[PDB]
Write a protein that holds these residues in place. Structure first.
Motif, PDB file in Angstrom:
ATOM      1  N   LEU A  27       0.847  -1.186   0.000  1.00 45.89           N
ATOM      2  CA  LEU A  27       0.000   0.000   0.000  1.00 45.89           C
ATOM      3  C   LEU A  27       0.883   1.238   0.000  1.00 45.89           C
ATOM      4  O   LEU A  27       1.802   1.348   0.819  1.00 45.89           O
ATOM      5  N   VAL A  28       0.609   2.164  -0.913  1.00 49.92           N
ATOM      6  CA  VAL A  28       1.329   3.428  -0.994  1.00 49.92           C
ATOM      7  C   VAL A  28       0.338   4.558  -0.760  1.00 49.92           C
ATOM      8  O   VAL A  28      -0.691   4.640  -1.441  1.00 49.92           O
ATOM      9  N   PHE A  29       0.645   5.422   0.204  1.00 52.49           N
ATOM     10  CA  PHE A  29      -0.168   6.592   0.514  1.00 52.49           C
ATOM     11  C   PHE A  29       0.686   7.833   0.314  1.00 52.49           C
ATOM     12  O   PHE A  29       1.700   8.005   0.997  1.00 52.49           O
ATOM     13  N   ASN A  30       0.274   8.698  -0.607  1.00 53.92           N
ATOM     14  CA  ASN A  30       1.012   9.924  -0.876  1.00 53.92           C
ATOM     15  C   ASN A  30       0.068  10.926  -1.524  1.00 53.92           C
ATOM     16  O   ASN A  30      -1.079  10.610  -1.852  1.00 53.92           O
ATOM     17  N   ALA A  31       0.562  12.149  -1.696  1.00 52.96           N
ATOM     18  CA  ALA A  31      -0.132  13.189  -2.440  1.00 52.96           C
ATOM     19  C   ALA A  31       0.712  13.562  -3.646  1.00 52.96           C
ATOM     20  O   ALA A  31       1.901  13.866  -3.505  1.00 52.96           O
ATOM     21  N   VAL A  32       0.096  13.552  -4.832  1.00 50.75           N
ATOM     22  CA  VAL A  32       0.834  13.849  -6.056  1.00 50.75           C
ATOM     23  C   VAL A  32       1.014  15.336  -6.293  1.00 50.75           C
ATOM     24  O   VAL A  32       1.588  15.720  -7.319  1.00 50.75           O
ATOM     25  N   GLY A  33       0.551  16.186  -5.382  1.00 49.68           N
ATOM     26  CA  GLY A  33       0.762  17.612  -5.519  1.00 49.68           C
ATOM     27  C   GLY A  33       2.020  18.103  -4.835  1.00 49.68           C
ATOM     28  O   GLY A  33       2.593  19.122  -5.230  1.00 49.68           O
ATOM     29  N   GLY A  34       2.459  17.388  -3.803  1.00 52.05           N
ATOM     30  CA  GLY A  34       3.645  17.778  -3.076  1.00 52.05           C
ATOM     31  C   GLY A  34       4.904  17.126  -3.608  1.00 52.05           C
ATOM     32  O   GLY A  34       4.855  16.116  -4.304  1.00 52.05           O
ATOM     33  N   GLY A  35       6.044  17.728  -3.265  1.00 50.83           N
ATOM     34  CA  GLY A  35       7.316  17.213  -3.742  1.00 50.83           C
ATOM     35  C   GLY A  35       7.685  15.870  -3.139  1.00 50.83           C
ATOM     36  O   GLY A  35       8.202  14.992  -3.833  1.00 50.83           O
ATOM     37  N   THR A  36       7.438  15.698  -1.838  1.00 53.99           N
ATOM     38  CA  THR A  36       7.782  14.440  -1.183  1.00 53.99           C
ATOM     39  C   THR A  36       6.861  13.314  -1.636  1.00 53.99           C
ATOM     40  O   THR A  36       7.309  12.181  -1.841  1.00 53.99           O
ATOM     41  N   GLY A  37       5.573  13.608  -1.804  1.00 52.40           N
ATOM     42  CA  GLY A  37       4.654  12.594  -2.290  1.00 52.40           C
ATOM     43  C   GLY A  37       4.916  12.203  -3.731  1.00 52.40           C
ATOM     44  O   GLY A  37       4.806  11.031  -4.095  1.00 52.40           O
ATOM     45  N   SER A  38       5.264  13.176  -4.571  1.00 55.50           N
ATOM     46  CA  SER A  38       5.523  12.884  -5.976  1.00 55.50           C
ATOM     47  C   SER A  38       6.930  12.337  -6.173  1.00 55.50           C
ATOM     48  O   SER A  38       7.111  11.252  -6.731  1.00 55.50           O
ATOM     49  N   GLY A  39       7.935  13.082  -5.723  1.00 53.87           N
ATOM     50  CA  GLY A  39       9.319  12.719  -5.951  1.00 53.87           C
ATOM     51  C   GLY A  39       9.761  11.467  -5.227  1.00 53.87           C
ATOM     52  O   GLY A  39      10.196  10.501  -5.862  1.00 53.87           O
ATOM     53  N   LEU A  40       9.665  11.472  -3.897  1.00 54.68           N
ATOM     54  CA  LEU A  40      10.051  10.294  -3.131  1.00 54.68           C
ATOM     55  C   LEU A  40       9.076   9.146  -3.345  1.00 54.68           C
ATOM     56  O   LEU A  40       9.455   7.979  -3.197  1.00 54.68           O
ATOM     57  N   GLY A  41       7.825   9.454  -3.688  1.00 53.56           N
ATOM     58  CA  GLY A  41       6.887   8.403  -4.040  1.00 53.56           C
ATOM     59  C   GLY A  41       7.267   7.692  -5.323  1.00 53.56           C
ATOM     60  O   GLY A  41       7.208   6.463  -5.402  1.00 53.56           O
ATOM     61  N   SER A  42       7.663   8.454  -6.346  1.00 50.23           N
ATOM     62  CA  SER A  42       8.099   7.845  -7.597  1.00 50.23           C
ATOM     63  C   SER A  42       9.420   7.113  -7.423  1.00 50.23           C
ATOM     64  O   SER A  42       9.636   6.059  -8.033  1.00 50.23           O
ATOM     65  N   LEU A  43      10.322   7.665  -6.609  1.00 48.49           N
ATOM     66  CA  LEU A  43      11.606   7.018  -6.368  1.00 48.49           C
ATOM     67  C   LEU A  43      11.435   5.708  -5.613  1.00 48.49           C
ATOM     68  O   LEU A  43      12.102   4.716  -5.925  1.00 48.49           O
ATOM     69  N   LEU A  44      10.547   5.685  -4.617  1.00 47.69           N
ATOM     70  CA  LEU A  44      10.312   4.453  -3.873  1.00 47.69           C
ATOM     71  C   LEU A  44       9.577   3.425  -4.722  1.00 47.69           C
ATOM     72  O   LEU A  44       9.861   2.226  -4.632  1.00 47.69           O
ATOM     73  N   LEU A  45       8.631   3.874  -5.550  1.00 49.16           N
ATOM     74  CA  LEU A  45       7.893   2.949  -6.405  1.00 49.16           C
ATOM     75  C   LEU A  45       8.785   2.366  -7.493  1.00 49.16           C
ATOM     76  O   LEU A  45       8.627   1.200  -7.873  1.00 49.16           O
ATOM     77  N   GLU A  46       9.713   3.170  -8.017  1.00 49.05           N
ATOM     78  CA  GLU A  46      10.649   2.676  -9.021  1.00 49.05           C
ATOM     79  C   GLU A  46      11.577   1.618  -8.439  1.00 49.05           C
ATOM     80  O   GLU A  46      11.869   0.612  -9.095  1.00 49.05           O
ATOM     81  N   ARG A  47      12.049   1.828  -7.212  1.00 44.96           N
ATOM     82  CA  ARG A  47      12.941   0.864  -6.585  1.00 44.96           C
ATOM     83  C   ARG A  47      12.203  -0.368  -6.084  1.00 44.96           C
ATOM     84  O   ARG A  47      12.779  -1.461  -6.071  1.00 44.96           O
ATOM     85  N   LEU A  48      10.946  -0.218  -5.662  1.00 43.97           N
ATOM     86  CA  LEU A  48      10.190  -1.368  -5.183  1.00 43.97           C
ATOM     87  C   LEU A  48       9.853  -2.343  -6.302  1.00 43.97           C
ATOM     88  O   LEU A  48       9.648  -3.530  -6.030  1.00 43.97           O
ATOM     89  N   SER A  49       9.786  -1.872  -7.548  1.00 43.50           N
ATOM     90  CA  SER A  49       9.576  -2.782  -8.666  1.00 43.50           C
ATOM     91  C   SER A  49      10.841  -3.556  -9.004  1.00 43.50           C
ATOM     92  O   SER A  49      10.766  -4.627  -9.616  1.00 43.50           O
ATOM     93  N   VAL A  50      12.004  -3.037  -8.617  1.00 42.16           N
ATOM     94  CA  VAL A  50      13.266  -3.685  -8.960  1.00 42.16           C
ATOM     95  C   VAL A  50      13.525  -4.876  -8.048  1.00 42.16           C
ATOM     96  O   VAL A  50      13.731  -6.003  -8.512  1.00 42.16           O
ATOM     97  N   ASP A  51      13.517  -4.645  -6.734  1.00 42.39           N
ATOM     98  CA  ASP A  51      13.861  -5.707  -5.799  1.00 42.39           C
ATOM     99  C   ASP A  51      12.741  -6.726  -5.633  1.00 42.39           C
ATOM    100  O   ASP A  51      13.015  -7.898  -5.351  1.00 42.39           O
ATOM    101  N   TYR A  52      11.489  -6.311  -5.799  1.00 42.08           N
ATOM    102  CA  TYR A  52      10.336  -7.155  -5.512  1.00 42.08           C
ATOM    103  C   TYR A  52       9.521  -7.369  -6.778  1.00 42.08           C
ATOM    104  O   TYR A  52       9.084  -6.404  -7.412  1.00 42.08           O
TER     105      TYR A  52
END
Ligand SMILES: Nc1nc2c(ncn2[C@@H]2O[C@H](COP(=O)(O)OP(=O)(O)OP(=O)(O)O)[C@@H](O)[C@H]2O)c(=O)[nH]1
Ligand SMILES: Nc1nc2c(ncn2[C@@H]2O[C@H](COP(=O)(O)OP(=O)(O)O)[C@@H](O)[C@H]2O)c(=O)[nH]1
Ligand SMILES: [Mg+2]
Lengths: 48, 22, 432, 186, 431, 48
Positions: C127-152
């Motif tokens: 489960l991913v909870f973020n806001a796509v309007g903010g920098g942390t929700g968009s940026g770190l959300g995309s970075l975490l989602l990109e890496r989570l597809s790699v290892d898992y």
């Protein structure tokens, strides 16, 4: 085609050609911004 | 004798008027 | 044992995270200190642990909203290692959260992911909870989602992203962050659910007669939507909808994975007694556009796949009757290539009420998550906001200077235009 | 370097036309670009330095900072195009008292300033292309009592189009200029 | 753990910043002696943003004071709340710049810059995670407008990833307090456009109308204007020091309020102002503050915001309020008068809330505006420049300190470039 | 089955979609969504 190009070049003046070297670019701008109609047509072709 | 944003069009030719005003 | 690891990113992620784990602990009777209430009982309480720790991660680059959890009423439920803070926030910039300063914390965040994955026996999803309007929700959300597809791999990723309202916003670079984040949710998120703040305000204002709602009132019922959709794993029922049942029945195509949400019995305490709340009329009110968590008209598009999840004492007899009454209405339109358009899940546990919460005690509830072509209505409005701001190329030197290039703006825009084309092609019908 | 390799008359230190123009010159850019562009009026490939900031981007003839250059000639001739923009060049010399004196000419100032270590100079140019004849011995004799011995550093940090910068013993006009040094070819 | 270095330059910067630390000490509970005496834990949660803990548990402000005349620091040190500051931070000169930008920026201020930059570097390296450097100074003077902008240029080279919150007062339109106001204002704005990350614009005349028309102070003293200015400065940093439902730090404001790198001059205003004759009749609600927020008379800038379009406006709300009232009021202010807002940026308003209102008020808000109407201010000063520049009047005092007359033409051709893009952004339209 | 049914209907579908130029889709969806927002602004609730 060469005659048409020479006819164009006889009036288009000596254009500053692109650099064969391009030695350094600190900001690394790369490609430039396309025009509006050309960019819309290119995006439409890519989406087609 | 004889595509780009408005801020960039100002900034590119601004140094020419920096010279010219003197 | 079936389990889901949740990840809460950014300001909106963990404010919902405070609300969702408030409802999660009350559903299972878990006390705020973490311990559920002769020689073994002394051993089980002090030396051992009857404590239950959440399988969540609360990460944000700004510490103020993180240390509120560390100093709040739920300071003992979470591990101190589990909540991740930072020095400087991404500060409304997809460039900072994805390239410059989100890169330092995403390596630390995956280490706590690895500890949570080793603790569990069998994982089912994310489960991913973020806001796509903010920098942390968009940026770190995309970075975490990109890496989570790699290892898992083979582990699904569920997305609950608070998309911007069409009219009101709390930020000015709001179209830029959502466009760049959208390209990551198409590529890396298996299921994403739209959430719109203005639609939650209208639900709070009208059906729950709160004239002055705040974010605490919004997140209390967003947590009701999140808790209901994973509730089939926690509790038993007549019909179950697992987290892999949810993918296989609401994405006809790999690119279309955007679903709406709705909660049917949003009735206040005073209005509850006069209201007759049976299965027939809550499902009629479930498809009501005033009861949707996304500010869009579903009559503009047509539903592709819809999942009705029920809580409380609901027999399978009347949920089928509610299916038949909806299908015969001329305003609710289904696409022609999905005749069997519904999945019904029944959970025997009635929906719990937050003490001091606005919602009343009801024995029936519907959590309606539906795949519709009306999502392209949402992305078209957000696209036109992006095209006007990008024509003058404003708010770009913030993004270009902090790692990003100019080409990512046109690349993520081109992916969204494909999605606009994708809904118009999939939603097309064959007649005679 | 360049002390033993002494040539009579002219001594070309940097020529733009060739297989590799930046053979000995170090490069440095910051929010700018170095670009070998064939111009319009000459239709010949000339190097170009561009930058939004003057002091950030530069090219220096000695590549290593510790190493020094040596030319005993008292004239430095640069053929540059006037871009109607900031220009700035800087020449460091070793004087009679074995002291390092830096003459630094720029387009963004109108009054000359002589500090005990660095002298700053104005530069005014004509419309199109130009050649500038920096007289090392005369300028160091006007600035200070000492006399020229050698030039240690030459460095242009500007927005300009350079080709054919070199060292000369004395003023040489077109009719006695060597074959490939013209850039005009009458 | 985010933290701001305060730098006060000149007579104006010292006098305003003396009143600025009065509010911050009272908000965090720091007594006149320096020791903590707050009544809430939320004040003590973030003290390290502005104060350094010393022996005895008392807190010294992270403030560096600079002026070339010893008269101003005697008033700051001997005045109330004057013992909190560190005497080592009192880096100051003897000769006196005296309203001359050339003396403060080139000759006389330069022998003190290596001393003031030493104590700023000590304050910056000691603390852990910086935000930027908040600087308070003037532009009509020469000691703070001169020496302050030399530090701003120098501190940008040392720390290029940190911001520069500058609170600079401008020459008044109706009156001049120094005869060389157009010289120092044009020569400092040019030194601020490429160095300062974001600029807050103040003036004495706009605060005079606020003190008379709204607060009904017929005799508004020299610190009454500073109290209104100090309330704005605390309102900018409110989300850092205290929690909230929507926290917005300094970098969130500048990424939202700055569309293009040179349009970083802002007009400010504090919303809940009323006289004691009308205190008991005002209904302090989100509609009431929003009505007072967007009024032209509430702004602390001489430029009338009705003349131009707001490119981006931000409001830093404080108090236990609902977000939807904040949401729907700022949605409504765009729709009722959309001519006065720019059209090619949708959602011009940056809204954020802080759950702790200031001491004595149940609700407050601090407004930031990037309006193109501020070009009327730069047009007026440049009009006063060319009248004085064309006769070389009061010019040999500037060129007598080694300055070329190129820097005069350098300064206003960036001033003329600054006012030109403000006009072109207002006129520009989308589709 | 593929050549007789699926290739034919996908050819018709992709031909119609490629005939549809994207700017028309964004214009139409923008107009419809603005109509919905105008109705829910000036009207007390929208009911299905
Ligand atoms: N539903 C809901 N949405 C929230 C809440 N808090 C913030 N938001 C959303 O968040 C958006 C603002 O961006 P933020 O999420 O605050 O940005 P951020 O997570 O702080 O990321 P950075 O600014 O880079 O630190 C608003 O448009 C809201 O829609 C909340 O408590 N509940
Ligand atoms: N609002 C306000 N303005 C001030 C204050 N002190 C000085 N000024 C303004 O600063 C300008 C004069 O600056 P000056 O004292 O010469 O600064 P200096 O040259 O650095 O010493 C005048 O226009 C004043 O209006 C103050 O306490 N509050
Ligand atoms: Mg944040």
């Amino acid at each position: 085609a060469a005659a048409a190009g020479a006819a164009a070049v006889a009036a288009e003046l000596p254009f500053v050609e692109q650099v064969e070297e391009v030695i350094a670019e600190a900001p690394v701008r790369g490609p430039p911004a396309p025009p509006p109609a050309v960019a819309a047509a290119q995006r439409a072709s890519r989406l087609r | 004798r004889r595509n780009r944003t408005i801020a960039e069009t100002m900034r590119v030719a601004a140094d020419t008027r920096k010279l010219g005003k003197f | 044992m079936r389990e889901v690891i949740s990840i809460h990113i950014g300001q909106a992620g963990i404010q919902v995270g405070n609300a969702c784990w408030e409802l999660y602990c009350l559903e299972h009777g878990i006390q705020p200190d973490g311990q559920m209430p002769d020689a073994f009982n002394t051993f089980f309480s002090e030396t051992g642990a009857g404590k239950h720790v959440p399988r969540c991660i609360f990460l944000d680059l700004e510490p103020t909203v993180v240390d509120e959890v560390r100093t709040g009423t739920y300071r003992q439920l979470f591990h101190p290692e589990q909540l991740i803070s930072g020095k400087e926030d991404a500060a409304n910039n997809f460039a900072r959260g994805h390239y410059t300063i989100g890169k330092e914390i995403v390596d630390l965040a995956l280490d706590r992911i690895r500890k949570l994955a080793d603790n569990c026996t069998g994982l089912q999803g994310f489960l991913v909870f973020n806001a796509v309007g903010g920098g942390t929700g968009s940026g770190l959300g995309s970075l975490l989602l990109e890496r989570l597809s790699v290892d898992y791999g083979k582990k699904s990723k569920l997305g609950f992203t608070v998309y911007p309202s069409p009219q009101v916003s709390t930020a000015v670079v709001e179209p830029y962050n959502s466009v760049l984040s959208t390209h990551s949710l198409l590529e890396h998120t298996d299921v994403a659910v739209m959430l719109d703040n203005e639609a939650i305000y209208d639900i709070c204002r009208r059906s729950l007669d709160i004239e002055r709602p705040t974010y605490t009132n919004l997140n209390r019922l967003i947590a009701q939507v999140i808790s209901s959709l994973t509730a089939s794993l926690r509790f038993d029922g007549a019909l179950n909808v697992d987290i892999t049942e949810f993918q296989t029945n609401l994405v006809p195509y790999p690119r279309i994975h955007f679903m709406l949400s709705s909660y049917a019995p949003i009735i206040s305490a005073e209005k509850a007694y006069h209201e007759q709340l049976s299965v027939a009329e809550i499902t009629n009110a479930a498809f009501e556009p005033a009861s949707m968590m996304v500010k869009c008209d579903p009559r503009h598009g047509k539903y592709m796949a819809c999942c009705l999840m029920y809580r409380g004492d609901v027999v399978p007899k009347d949920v089928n009757a509610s299916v038949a009454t909806i299908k015969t209405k001329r305003t609710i339109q289904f696409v022609d290539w999905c005749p069997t358009g519904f999945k019904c899940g029944i959970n025997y546990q009635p929906p719990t009420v937050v003490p001091g919460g606005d919602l009343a005690k009801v024995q029936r509830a519907v959590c309606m998550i539906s795949n519709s072509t009306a999502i392209g209505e949402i992305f078209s409005r957000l696209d036109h906001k992006f095209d006007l701001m990008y024509a003058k190329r404003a708010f770009v030197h913030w993004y270009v200077g902090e790692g990003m290039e100019e080409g990512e703006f046109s690349e993520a825009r081109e992916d969204l235009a494909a999605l606009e084309k994708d809904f118009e092609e999939v939603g097309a019908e064959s007649a005679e | 370097m360049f002390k033993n390799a002494f040539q009579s008359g002219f001594l070309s230190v940097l020529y733009s036309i060739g297989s590799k123009p930046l053979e000995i010159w170090d490069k440095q850019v910051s929010n700018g670009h170095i670009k070998r562009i064939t111009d319009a009026d000459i239709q010949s490939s000339v190097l170009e330095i561009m930058g939004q900031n003057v002091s950030t981007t530069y090219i220096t003839c000695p590549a290593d900072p510790n190493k020094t250059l040596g030319i005993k000639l008292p004239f430095l001739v640069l053929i540059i195009k006037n871009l109607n923009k900031y220009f700035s060049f800087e020449v460091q010399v070793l004087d009679d008292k074995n002291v390092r004196r830096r003459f630094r000419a720029s387009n963004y100032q109108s009054t000359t300033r002589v500090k005990p270590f660095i002298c700053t100079m104005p530069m005014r140019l004509d419309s199109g292309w130009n050649q500038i004849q920096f007289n090392l011995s005369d300028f160091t004799r006007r600035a200070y009592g000492t006399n020229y011995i050698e030039t240690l550093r030459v460095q242009v940090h500007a927005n300009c189009r350079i080709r054919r910068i070199y060292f000369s013993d004395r003023l040489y006009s077109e009719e006695e200029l060597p074959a490939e040094f013209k850039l005009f070819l009458p | 753990m985010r933290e701001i270095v305060h730098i006060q330059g000149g007579q104006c910067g010292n006098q305003i910043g003396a009143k600025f630390w009065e509010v911050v000490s009272d908000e965090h509970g720091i007594d006149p002696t320096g020791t903590y005496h707050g009544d809430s834990d939320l004040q003590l949660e973030r003290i390290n943003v502005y104060f350094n803990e010393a022996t005895g548990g008392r807190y010294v402000p992270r403030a560096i004071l600079m002026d070339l005349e010893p008269g101003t620091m005697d008033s700051v040190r001997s005045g109330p709340y004057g013992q909190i500051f560190r005497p080592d931070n009192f880096v100051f000169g003897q000769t006196g710049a005296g309203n001359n930008w050339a003396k403060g920026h080139y000759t006389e201020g330069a022998e003190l810059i290596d001393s003031v930059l030493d104590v700023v570097r000590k304050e910056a390296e000691s603390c852990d995670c910086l935000q930027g450097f908040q600087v308070c100074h003037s532009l009509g003077g020469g000691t703070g407008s001169g020496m302050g902008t030399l530090l701003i240029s120098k501190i940008r080279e040392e720390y290029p990833d940190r911001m520069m919150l500058t609170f600079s007062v401008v020459p008044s339109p109706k009156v001049s307090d120094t005869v060389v106001e157009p010289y120092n204002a044009t020569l400092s704005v040019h030194q601020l456009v490429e160095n300062a990350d974001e600029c807050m614009v103040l003036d004495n005349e706009a605060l005079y109308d606020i003190c008379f028309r709204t607060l009904k102070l017929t005799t508004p003293t020299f610190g009454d204007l500073n109290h209104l200015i100090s309330a704005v400065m605390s309102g900018i940093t409110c989300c850092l020091r205290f929690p909230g439902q929507l926290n917005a730090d300094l970098r969130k404001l500048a990424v939202n309020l700055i569309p293009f790198p040179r349009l970083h001059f802002f007009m400010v205003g504090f919303t809940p102002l009323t006289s004691r004759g009308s205190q008991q009749y005002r209904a302090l609600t989100v509609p009431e503050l929003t009505q007072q927020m967007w009024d032209a008379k509430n702004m602390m800038c001489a430029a009338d915001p009705r003349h131009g379009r707001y490119l981006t406006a931000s409001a830093l709300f404080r108090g236990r309020m609902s977000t939807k009232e904040v949401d729907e009021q700022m949605l409504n202010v765009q729709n009722k008068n959309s001519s006065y807002f720019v059209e090619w940026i949708p959602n011009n308003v940056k809204s954020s809330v802080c759950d702790i209102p200031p001491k004595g008020l149940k609700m407050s808000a601090t407004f930031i505006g990037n309006s193109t109407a501020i070009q009327e201010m730069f047009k007026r000063v440049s009009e006063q420049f060319t009248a004085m520049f064309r006769r070389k009047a009061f010019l040999h005092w500037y060129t007598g300190e080694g300055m070329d007359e190129m820097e005069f033409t350098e300064a206003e051709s960036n001033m003329n470039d600054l006012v030109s893009e403000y006009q072109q952004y207002q006129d520009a339209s989308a589709e | 089955w593929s050549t007789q049914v699926f290739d034919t209907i996908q050819g018709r579908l992709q031909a119609a979609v490629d005939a549809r130029d994207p700017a028309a889709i964004e214009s139409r969806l923008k107009t419809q969504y603005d109509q919905y927002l105008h109705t829910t602004n000036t009207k007390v609730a929208v009911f299905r």
